[PDB]
Amino acid sequence: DGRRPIRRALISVYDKTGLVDLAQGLSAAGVEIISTGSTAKTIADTGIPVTPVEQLTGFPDGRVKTLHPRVHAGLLADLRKSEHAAALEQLGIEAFELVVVNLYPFSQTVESGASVDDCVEQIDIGGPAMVRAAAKNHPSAAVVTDPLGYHGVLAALRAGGFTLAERKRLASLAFQHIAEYDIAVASWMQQTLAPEHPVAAFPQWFGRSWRRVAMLRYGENPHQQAALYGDPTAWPGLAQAEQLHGKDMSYNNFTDADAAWRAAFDHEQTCVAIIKHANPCGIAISSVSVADAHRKAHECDPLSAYGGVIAANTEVSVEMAEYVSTIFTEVIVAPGYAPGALDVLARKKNIRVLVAAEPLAGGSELRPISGGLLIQQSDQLDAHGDNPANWTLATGSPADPATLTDLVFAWRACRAVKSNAIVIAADGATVGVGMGQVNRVDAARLAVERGGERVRGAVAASDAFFPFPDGLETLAAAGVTAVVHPGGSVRDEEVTEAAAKAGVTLYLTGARHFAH
Amino acid sequence: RRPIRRALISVYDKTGLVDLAQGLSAAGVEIISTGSTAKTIADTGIPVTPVEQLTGFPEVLDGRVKTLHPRVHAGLLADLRKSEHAAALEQLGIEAFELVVVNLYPFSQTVESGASVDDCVEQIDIGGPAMVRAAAKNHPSAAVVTDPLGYHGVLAALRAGGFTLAERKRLASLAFQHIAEYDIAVASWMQQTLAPEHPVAAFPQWFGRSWRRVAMLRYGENPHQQAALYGDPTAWPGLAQAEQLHGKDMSYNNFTDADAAWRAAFDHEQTCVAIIKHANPCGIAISSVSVADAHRKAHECDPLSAYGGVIAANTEVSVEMAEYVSTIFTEVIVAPGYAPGALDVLARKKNIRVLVAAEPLAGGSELRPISGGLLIQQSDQLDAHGDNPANWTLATGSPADPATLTDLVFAWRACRAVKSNAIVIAADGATVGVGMGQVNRVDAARLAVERGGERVRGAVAASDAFFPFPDGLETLAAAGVTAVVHPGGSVRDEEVTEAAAKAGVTLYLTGARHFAH
């Protein structure tokens, strides 16, 4: 088992939470406590005897208190080797079985908005060196870096020490915390201490760590395994969603929920988005209710909504839940659910019901690629051209207020559709969506075929300019009255002429919204 | 700015050390060093103060604690801006270090060749990182160099009367990046090898990674978004390490498309060329003749969509292929290499980005970030039990002739790279109709048939997921498709099998799914 009885413990903690309880426990079991500064005073003020580190070393400007061989030899001596044991005995140095250290809170000093000098001062040197030394010498030493493990220490103390397996685990955790601490120190120094000139949108180095939340049902396909990880520092998202009902989440369930969440919060009005394979099959807004927004979004493409992922940018009502319960739905994500809505959704056993925190706009997006990573600013639909006031009317009569709000809806909805994308919309609802096409005219053909009869009199949005007039002709031939696209082709006037010939209102934004 | 008087050197890699040491010694700098670093310097006749003289502590525990001493760290950590700290050093008899040169044993680089658990544990450096962190924390006084790359900078600093405060801040920032990279590597190895969890978990409880900026891209997904490319120095080279031989700067989409085209091409054993548009193939083809034949076949699938496409070949691009690529509007071409004269033919068009990438190593993990976290999965290597045609179930119709079967295997493997819901119609080792990224399976079948046109009659088809209803299969059968391959697995499978039986279509069930997003 490899249990070693605890005889000497080295305690040097910034956070003194649970320290007196731990110290009482250790002292009662005849453990010698060796401690530094304010940790030693906290213990001694209770009457518990404590050996100062200065008595061990015989050396007294603060910043270098435990960086001494009479500390580190006791931590690093491999007691499995006779020659290391003999060296300690000859130097009159005893080993430490237990090392309890928690570091200067650097990330919290930064989080409180302290100066450069104050944050630099909270960079611990001795602490990580003690933790790494005890972690490296896990066959002999046990290292605890959080007051959470203190009852584990008193339990191990009662059991005649920690096992070898327990000490390996503690060492592994110790090195994770040191890596997290250093990521935080390196990230802050790059940003605040030594930034680039001229200041750059993305830094020269990027580092992050995550903690496993759960194993998923499977990956993108059942022969692939997958896991979900959370970023404890980040603002809560889908990775922190609360599951209130249903079978376990798969990888695709999470990617779809994330895509549906983003598509719903891309609208100011009450909005419901229905997603299939990271693409919307139906999006709608309402000035009436969530239920009306869900009905409109579902009626766009009921055949595709089968096994869909639903997101609402407001509380799901009982009225909406009743309709969702009659449709095959895999996932529903919302900022909350009205009294009785969860019970209506729970009528179907498998549907995953999630509660998520409302999104925080203006972040950076990570996109991994083979051998590396792409980092970009997220498309927040806030470009100069995303404001309809900044649109250029290329041909036709200006849109009436109802036609314009539909154009803004179709325009904002085209962001979430994978490229090449065409969104045909009317009365704040999509009627035909042409997604993920390798050419623009096929995306226009798709949206027209799906839209069916509802295309006549509707508006359309193109996420990129029409390179040739055929894509626009497809929409005009189907009865689309107004079209909004970025413009920007050398062939723009051919496209504008085709819309002029058809008597179609055409707007140019100068802003593009590809998504993949 | 501070003149360098005392330097602390402890380097694993001794590259440029003697040139640095002769530079420092000539400028009257006292070198404080230990072990093999001190011998390398002394063997040249350059005087060196051993760390053991400074500490006065004997040779114990295989050097595990040699520099963890206050006469080392007080010299590093004394804030010389505080008269009190400067007064403390005098009262204790400890001099300051203006320069700290430390390079560690390459832990990350040797985990793959780590002899045992005990040997890797022994390689964990304690003193080294503590010296680097201490000098980095005390950057207002100390300069910390962790790579022989910065030695030229040190000699230049010696000529100008020391490093500036701004230079020392930058060095400290780099020092902490290297420390963080070292610790990510030690933490990752301990989780995996030292203390793994029981029962066996495919993905560990903690995951950490860092990247280094390679370049700023033309723009992000759209021009109003900025973007940058980062590389993983520990990983096997991929698209992030590609060498650009020609063309305008790469955009974010150029890289995502190149990555998708690279993966689609290496999904085939035979000579293969994939043409991608918005992360989806518009044309894929294999050849037993040449790369040029594979590119022509793939381009013929959909020439209108190949306009502004991203091309990947899983073999060397020939002159013959470059000559056809030069007549077509192409944004990016990625290949493991180019034949003599092929690059010159490609360079006839100014803007085309010509890239050379390392052949991929199968069986890795994929990262997919989501709001507030990350999804990690095993990559789909097309090696499931059902990916072997020998393990397919013939549900109806006559068994496929050898030519029909090889086309089915091609269509099947090609359907992996197409975004879901996906349908691939193929013939003679080439796609003729691709239905991609559809919110419903029957629309993906309709797309593939409309694009395929006349070519669909007599061709084979592959579905990346089962047909939930017979309509998607009826669409293919009504168009003249002779054989179809899909996973099966629906409660409605027999309705789908009956529809194929009614049409006299050969139908195979694999039991393996290949969604991609």
Ligand SMILES: O=CNc1c(C(=O)O)ncn1[C@@H]1O[C@H](COP(=O)(O)O)[C@@H](O)[C@H]1O
């Ligand atoms: O960077 C300095 N940190 C060091 C050192 C050293 O630099 O020699 N020794 C112990 N520590 C840490 O000091 C804190 C505990 O000391 P107190 O007991 O006085 O609060 C805890 O945060 C311990 O990490």
Ligand SMILES: NC(=O)c1ncn([C@@H]2O[C@H](COP(=O)(O)O)[C@@H](O)[C@H]2O)c1N
């Ligand atoms: N056979 C199909 O077309 C199919 N099978 C499942 N799905 C949908 O794929 C999504 C991912 O399913 P899984 O959670 O099995 O990864 C869920 O929306 C699901 O209804 C399909 N479109």
Ligand SMILES: NC(=O)c1ncn([C@@H]2O[C@H](COP(=O)(O)O)[C@@H](O)[C@H]2O)c1N
């Ligand atoms: N207007 C369009 O449909 C369009 N404009 C550009 N593109 C293609 O988008 C891809 C990415 O372009 P960029 O690098 O600008 O992001 C390249 O293939 C490019 O030819 C389009 N499909």
Ligand SMILES: [K+]
């Ligand atoms: K889009």
Ligand SMILES: [K+]
């Ligand atoms: K696929």
